[PDB]
Design brief:
Two copies of one chain form a homodimer.
Chain A: H1 7-10, H2 18-29, H3 40-48, H4 51-56, H5 58-74, H6 76-84, H7 88-115, H8 128-143, H9 151-184, H10 188-218, H11 221-250, H12 253-257, H13 264-280
Helix pairs in contact in A: 2-7, 2-10, 5-7, 5-8, 5-9, 6-7, 7-10, 8-9, 8-11, 9-10, 9-11, 9-13, 10-11, 11-13
The complex binds palmitic acid (2 copies), fe (iii) ion (FE) (2 copies), manganese (II) ion (2 copies) and manganese (III) ion (MN3) (2 copies).
PDB class: oxidoreductase
Keywords: R2-like ligand-binding oxidase, MN/FE cofactor, ribonucleotide reductase R2 subunit fold, metalloprotein oxidoreductase, oxidoreductase
Assembly: dimeric
Chain lengths: 285, 285
Amino acid sequence: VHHDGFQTVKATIDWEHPMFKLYEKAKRNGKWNPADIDFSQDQKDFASLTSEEKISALPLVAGFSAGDEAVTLDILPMAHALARQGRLEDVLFLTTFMHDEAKHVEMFSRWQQAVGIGQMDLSVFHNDHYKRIFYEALPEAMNRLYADDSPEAVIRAATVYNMIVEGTLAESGYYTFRQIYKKAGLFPGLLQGIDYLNMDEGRHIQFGIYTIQRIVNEDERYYELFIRYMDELWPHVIGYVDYLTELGKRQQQLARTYALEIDYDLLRHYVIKQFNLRKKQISRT
Amino acid sequence: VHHDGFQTVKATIDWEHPMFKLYEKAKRNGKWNPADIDFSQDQKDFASLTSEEKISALPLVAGFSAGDEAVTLDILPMAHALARQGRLEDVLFLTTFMHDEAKHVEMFSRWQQAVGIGQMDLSVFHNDHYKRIFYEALPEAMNRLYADDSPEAVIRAATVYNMIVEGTLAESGYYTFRQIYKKAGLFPGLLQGIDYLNMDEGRHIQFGIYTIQRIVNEDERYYELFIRYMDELWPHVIGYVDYLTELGKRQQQLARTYALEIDYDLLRHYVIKQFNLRKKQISRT
Ligand SMILES: CCCCCCCCCCCCCCCC(=O)O
Ligand SMILES: CCCCCCCCCCCCCCCC(=O)O
Ligand SMILES: [Fe+3]
Ligand SMILES: [Fe+3]
Ligand SMILES: [Mn+2]
Ligand SMILES: [Mn+2]
Ligand SMILES: [Mn+3]
Ligand SMILES: [Mn+3]
């Protein structure tokens, strides 16, 4: 439908808006290019591994590659809905958000190509719980915004995307990568990429916090919805974590070879801790 | 609706896709930040001008500020429609496209703020022809893609957006800016910004060419649609150009002060030339 006018003709950008400030930071801190990462040592590492060691790393890469691809596609409805509400500074920031996720897809796909597994179908490592989050609940909640941009809908979208997928699962994934392979001295290019992703992610999570809090600020009963939507998804979060844990416990050879005492119970407590601290970053009042 | 799978889990990015190549170039060539442009001399230039000279530059800035704001909002349906078709490399490139346009909005709005006209409503310089393109036909054609992503719809969207708004009007606007103010030695920060915009724009127009040509390649009868949609919009293109020309001829003081023989007939022929050469970049066969 028609534009009735344009904010930067009638006035200017709201230079003090929190999302204009986050946009400015995204530009300053978002120059990294996956095409510049040197994966040559990663190719040698992967080739040096036994078949049993090779498998160890793939479940986590399968979760990230599909996850980054899903969030690249699935942020578009949020950008649309806030655009239609006239939230110009949010939209500007979301152009950095979307471009970040494109680079994330690129990074994991470059790693897979470089180490020689691009032709391998890693979908085998998505269990039913993962599919419920990433194949279903995430696209459902985001696409809803095209026909329903009510405060409830927007809260639910930000909860699933920014607070669960990013703020709980992605953060725990970055922590897991470091805990395992940074210890081993394995895959330096991938770990460089992970550091860049984890930096981008701080802004993504802050968008979600801002968005949920500004709706809760209008009506503190939306706080209860936020908690409810977090708890609805917890069973699939932990069901995926338990599945990856079980895979890790069955395939021990990378841990033994590289003298990693992989503390799966500690990783599980990191996930629980992530989930709970995301809840605490939203104030009921 | 659900994701049935993910290309970068089943396989990898198509590294040879023309739009992955354009994405790669966008990252290499898209580092500029409007926040780094020094507008201090532009503020002094604008203040030094008489009121009659001040007005001269505003119609063109009004056209660009609203135009960049419109295309920032209005590219989202294209990204959605190609995402839903599975065209992952197009989507990756379109994240650079969208972020470019956000910076363009930012750049013009920073200039307006710095020279002291942010509080002025520049909508007065949008005549009926401009409104028909930017307030109506552009959003209509792009939003259509949400419910109709047929080859006809996609061709029409790319024609209005990439071939007319960008490939005809924007290009002619950049040329006009240089012809007038680069001559005068006026507004160095704005002209730095214009050079960056004009560089981004080359990729935007190439997206539109790629998109229209790949549909024409399926069925050369779509070539006739492309020409028809270009000719439908020509009356509003030139009606806006004639309006800006008339404003230029009535307010002569900047030209006299700065010894610019502004050749409005030459600018008009540049627009006609742009329109015709965009037609020629699509091959019927
Ligand atoms: C073995 C302990 C389990 C640790 C949890 C690992 C979760 C893997 C992460 C996969 C989903 C990544 C989502 C990315 C979202 C984004 O890019 O914003
Ligand atoms: C006086 C001669 C007329 C020259 C034509 C000037 C047209 C002004 C341009 C305004 C529209 C700009 C659209 C920007 C689109 C984009 O950012 O991709
Ligand atoms: Fe993210
Ligand atoms: Fe453009
Ligand atoms: Mn289960
Ligand atoms: Mn007319
Ligand atoms: Mn990501
Ligand atoms: Mn532009």
